[PDB]
């Protein structure tokens, strides 16, 4: 179920309970400190629950939550976009469109079964996000893969960007 | 070892084991 924010988050369901900048949020069925607009009384079925990000108002900055503190009613929160650029750091978590290995070789997709045989279903890893044949790490890898379309080549790893130019 | 992880982990150390064994 997807932890990261496309477009101005209506969809977004991950589990971020801080604004962008510390403050936890409050649990949206709260009235101190302040009192919302959008209770998953009057807004049920919008994501409205626990004390996670949201946003219900088809704000043009998306998600966000109403902050614990009483100083500063409500305020945004951070939210990977998806798609993505470069691996962070070695992107237990890389949910971009690469799917050529270092070697070079194009990518074989977890759907298919050839030209290699293999465990990595992706029906079996829903989370695990097996689109296509887009280079990835499920496994606590050194950086993301894929099984190559090289029959003589099983799988390798891709060269994929680090945004920030182990881990730090 | 049920969950995923102890899954992964084996496939994973499976190709791992795998490639060791062709460099070879």
């Known amino acids: ?168 | 070892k049920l969950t995923a992880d102890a899954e992964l982990q084996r496939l994973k150390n499976e190709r791992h084991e795998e490639a060791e064994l062709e460099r070879l």
């Open chain 1, 1 to 168: 179920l997807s932890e990261c924010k496309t477009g101005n988050g209506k969809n977004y369901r991950g589990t971020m309970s801080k604004t962008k900048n510390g403050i936890t949020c409050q649990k949206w069925s709260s009235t101190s400190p302040h009192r919302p607009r959008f209770s998953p009384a009057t807004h049920p079925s919008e994501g409205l629950e626990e004390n996670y990000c949201r946003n219900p108002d088809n704000d043009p900055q998306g998600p966000w939550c109403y902050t614990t503190d009483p100083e500063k009613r409500y305020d945004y929160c951070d939210i990977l976009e998806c798609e993505e650029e470069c691996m962070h750091c070695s992107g237990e978590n890389y949910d971009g469109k690469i799917s050529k290995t270092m070697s070079g070789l194009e990518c074989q997709a977890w759907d298919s079964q050839s030209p290699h045989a293999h465990g990595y279903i992706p029906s079996k890893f829903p989370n695990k996000n097996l689109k296509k044949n887009y280079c990835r790490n499920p496994d606590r890898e050194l950086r993301p893969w894929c099984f190559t379309t090289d029959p003589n080549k099983r799988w390798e790893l891709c060269d994929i960007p680090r945004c920030t130019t182990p881990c730090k």
